[PDB]
């Protein structure tokens with residue numbers, strides 16, 4: 001049995017119209033149930049071209065094969081694609097950007113009367129002590145002091161939410177990655193930051209008041225605390241799915257090993273392949289949930 | 294002359310600007326950018342293409358085979374365009390997405406060995422106690438507690454930078470807007486938040502456990518403290534410019550009055566025009582800077 005998508009905002013029931021501004025969609029101009037009522041898997045990732053490539057890739061693998069219109073053709077803020085029960089949505093970079101996406105998304109699913117939905121971010125990250133190209137299935141999104149919490153300011157007051165992910169979904173994702181046997185995949189905690197450069201110990205930014213050994217000491221401590229990769233979205237993603245009772249996972253590839261460098265200098269061919277990795281893993285997970293009861 | 298507070302950069306054999314998809318070794322920065330004097334940055338890549346071409350035909354470069362190539366065709370992270378001494382760059386939404394852009398932009402300026410440069414953000418925001426369509430030229434970026442501070446965590450420890458903007462620049466842009474005499478323009482403070490929904494006291498996100506009354510109190514306290522608009526980029530932008538000693542301004546139109554509502558429900562025709570307002574202010578400022586010497 002699949003439960004209905006819920007909000008934690010009593011105000012939406014009471015509006016004549018709900019405008020999903022950054023999607024360019026609205027209750028008064030679109031029929032959400034007709035459009036989305038059969039969505040069961042939502043995949044989200046930074047790049048709109050990667051999310052279109054993902055919807056193409058997913059379409060072949062479930063034999064929906066044969067074009068894919070951008071459902072947000074009225075904005076350039078986010079891109080959205082659909083085939084069968086899979087919805088792909090781009091979210092840009094950083095907590096604030098995904099957070100805007102998530103609120104309108106969840107409202108979208110809620111208006112569509114969707115049920116039994118799974119949300120999975122597929123992204124990129126900096127690995128810590130992993131060969132580049134390793135995919136990490138995140139157990140706990142964790143903050144830059146290693147605590148699994150997400151701080152928000154709400155009317156000027158600090159509010160904190162827990163950022164763990166569904167354990168069983170991680171185990172199930174690992175099991176899929178094992179079935180493919182194409183690339184290494186570990187389960188690990190994931191540190192989420194607000195800055196790619198000073199925020200992640202890089203020596204490579206426009207500002208930096210610290211040294212290689214300072215960076216090393218910080219990355220090794222992260223490693224000991226269980227963290228295996230570093231990125232910029234996992235936290236709010238986990239906090240908001242938890243807040244609304246949605247089953248969610250984060251699956252990210254590792255573009256380089258941060259113990260060895262800051263700069264992403266792999267050839268473009270190799271970076272592209274690395275990217276196809278979480279799409280393959282998640283494509284396997286969708287294929288199995290569908291070949292099932 | 295532009296400069297970085299990062300001594301590691303001078304030592305690097307190459308500098309790869311990964312999210313621009315630009316590199317010192319595949320791209321000639323001085324040839325591409327040395328003549329740049331004004332850098333305009335905004336969230337949306339269509340807005341910024343629109344801006345570079347409005348500016349082109351307002352400084353007379355409005356030739357017939359008018360195409361302005363996206364110099365970042367290479368990634369889909371940001372768009373970038375150039376005409377003459379003017380560079381127009383998109384930055385996505387949220388403090389982290391613009392911080393990535395700034396780190397790489399600043400570096401780029403510096404590798405191009407640019408001089409006398411001005412950075413302006415042209416953006417959108419919610420106004421407090423202003424008619425919709427009002428342009429705010431920001432005096433101090435301020436956080437959700439109304440303090441002029443930008444907080445960053447670096448190697449696990451927390452640091453703050455002041456977020457004042459250049460006082461002589463904000464007055465100069467006030468004079469420009471007055472020369473156009475087309476839309477209201479006020480100088481005030483801008484609150485910068487990490488979330489568009491709960492972060493700006495909205496009541497229409499997927500999550501909300503406060504009331505309309507709490508929103509009004511919070512927003513009126515912001516207004517009492519000098520804040521005139523609310524948005525998501527001003528503070529890192531100020532902090533980063535201040536750090537690097539760059540002369541920088543923020544100019545945003547307000548898309549609605551938050552004392553009246555949360556949803557952006559103006560007609561497409563009206564919002565498009567609101568969004569050209571900061572583009573016309575900044576085009577004056579350029580036009581007349583270029584008429585000096």
Ligand SMILES: O=c1[nH]cc(F)c(=O)[nH]1
Pocket residue numbers: 124125126127196200230231232254255256264
């Ligand atoms: O947030 C990040 N994303 C991708 C990376 F490769 C990295 O180092 N950090």
Ligand SMILES: O=c1[nH]cc(F)c(=O)[nH]1
Pocket residue numbers: 417418419420489493523524525547548549557
């Ligand atoms: O950050 C914001 N940008 C644009 C808006 F209209 C708003 O309310 N907030």
Ligand SMILES: OC[C@@H]1OC=C[C@H]1O
Pocket residue numbers: 046092093094123124125196231232233
């Ligand atoms: O490379 C930029 C970032 O990659 C990881 C999360 C994205 O925002």
Ligand SMILES: OC[C@@H]1OC=C[C@H]1O
Pocket residue numbers: 336385386387416417418489524525526
């Ligand atoms: O509407 C979204 C936000 O607009 C204002 C700042 C952008 O990041």
